[PDB]
Symmetry: C6
Subunit: 94 residues, 6 copies
């Protein structure tokens, strides 16, 4: 598992057998932290919709034996969108 | 692909919005959407295979008012009903 | 092993000899399900109709090669919809 | 793990070292299915609050090696309460 | 009981509502509540210890409008603000 | 092993030599945290302020005796509240 992917173009450039259906950036990356050595990645991604957005938080932790623990959570946020017009993205009023 | 697959009801009740996967790295991630009256139900799914062949799994779900997955083109999107 | 293909209580009672049910075990009614007993997974959506809307549950279970399981659950309230079980195919729609 | 507990009185009568803080029936059992042999239990519990209720779904699956997999989920339901005045409980209008 | 415990902020931001546990059977289940303006945040927690000493964990969270955990008596409850 | 006591990005960068951060890594600001590095667990609440409310995340991680981990996450929207970080103790309150 590559712990530092930030967009679908960087994913296709680093995973040789990646298969993507639909718009791979439907959930745009808001922020992410990872340590390849400590084996973890945490990210927030946002899908803009009519009148609000869908916010996803993701955690993945690699174990010493090579296995993984995973968690995901999701919520709807009214009248906000992720702004992707800057280098540092944020959620704000539509 | 699955010889003994059994489906109850509409197996596409949650229609696929997007998906990424890698068979070698052993993970898949998808978003699926069920259109209902006045809004839609959005499901996110992650599955990761481990080196010993076992799996880690996660799921999350939310309601989105006044949106439907629009399947009228090749690229689906969630938008105003 | 876990039966991954149950669709209602009557079927569970007929296939699980020691099943114990408290209350109405069809409170969360099956909307859709897919499963493979040999590949070892099931995914289902269930709906509990309530006053003014319904509660929707999505459920995933995956069997591992060593016979253990991975599991996930998620839940949301849906206003002004109910599962309709009056026809061959069930659906969520306006109350 | 006892897979068939239905109320806090039955839990105290079967678990010798059980410790309960607060009202142990804050989340009242709505429905439950379990198989001791297949090793699983699934339950819905409901906490009545002002103007609505909190609904919890719980799944626990025992593995061949004696370990467990667990999952939980929670949502708020407006203008409904669990009715406990009958033997078979239901969620309905407050 | 925990010698190296480190707490940041108010360690009781989520106040305990109820809890059940068994040290021998190896599980604990709790509900905790954070009072906010106009409502409260309700967290449910489960932890199960395995025979090999490892753990399974689960968490869930929801917002409840116009309720607070009432801590004015020995038995706490969620009720109208 | 996982550092279970991080409270902000500056502390993570100073204690995790290969940390990589995309975007503003304090987007979810720490509200409260408890951890024991020796017992192997951490529990935290983080808040992302947005227009008209905030997003609240609760996070749990537990280390197992074999060095592996169990994890859980949950998330909800809270209307008309923000985390206030202007004082010694942070709190969620009216915007
Ligand atoms: N809820 C999802 N539903 C469907 N598909 C998803 C979801 N979530 C992730 N994906 C796909 O996996 C790829 C890499 O994911 P990843 O390497 O495992 O880490 P990440 O933090 O989740 O994604 C960070 C960025 O990557 C880009 O492509 C992603 C997505 O195409 C995206 O623009 C992300 O914003
Ligand atoms: N949130 C729940 N709360 C309480 N109890 C639950 C829940 N969810 C499931 N149960 C009980 O387990 C039995 C078998 O479940 P299962 O075999 O593991 O598969 P499934 O997809 O979850 O349920 C498919 C159908 O089975 C029937 O009986 C179920 C339920 O009585 C039902 O009519 C289901 O609609
Ligand atoms: N909440 C559910 N409730 C009931 N059943 C479900 C759910 N979720 C998935 N299923 C069933 O599993 C099949 C394959 O699942 P899969 O191979 O494991 O990956 P996926 O990302 O979840 O689904 C990608 C697409 O597959 C199609 O059939 C699905 C569904 O019939 C669907 O149209 C999906 O849109
Ligand atoms: N979100 C919770 N928060 C705090 N505490 C909880 C929660 N959930 C469960 N508990 C406690 O465990 C005991 C047994 O739990 P159990 O044996 O593991 O199975 P169950 O289906 O979850 O609970 C079925 C019934 O048991 C009674 O006592 C429960 C509770 O005091 C209750 O009235 C339940 O309605
Ligand atoms: N939902 C998230 N989405 C994206 N990224 C996240 C999330 N959640 C955490 N991160 C990143 O991991 C780093 C270390 O996290 P961690 O060490 O594993 O502990 P923690 O309790 O989750 O975060 C405590 C503080 O750490 C700082 O940096 C964090 C974050 O940049 C932050 O200011 C936290 O407020
Ligand atoms: N979402 C959280 N965010 C930050 N920190 C958290 C959260 N949740 C828990 N904590 C911290 O762990 C300590 C012990 O946790 P614990 O021993 O593992 O069990 P518990 O049921 O979760 O908490 C029972 C009571 O303990 C007190 O201190 C807690 C908290 O400081 C609290 O007042 C609890 O009300």
């Amino acid at each position: 598992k590559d712990l530092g992917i930030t967009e679908v173009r960087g994913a296709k450039a680093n995973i040789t057998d990646l298969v993507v259906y639909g718009n791979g950036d439907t959930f745009a990356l808001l922020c992410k932290a990872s340590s390849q050595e400590q084996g973890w990645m945490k990210s927030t991604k946002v899908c803009n919709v009519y009148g609000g957005c869908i916010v996803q938080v993701t955690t993945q932790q690699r174990n010493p034996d090579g296995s993984y623990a995973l968690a995901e959570a999701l919520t709807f946020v009214p009248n906000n969108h992720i702004d992707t017009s800057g280098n540092t993205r944020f959620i704000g009023k539509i």
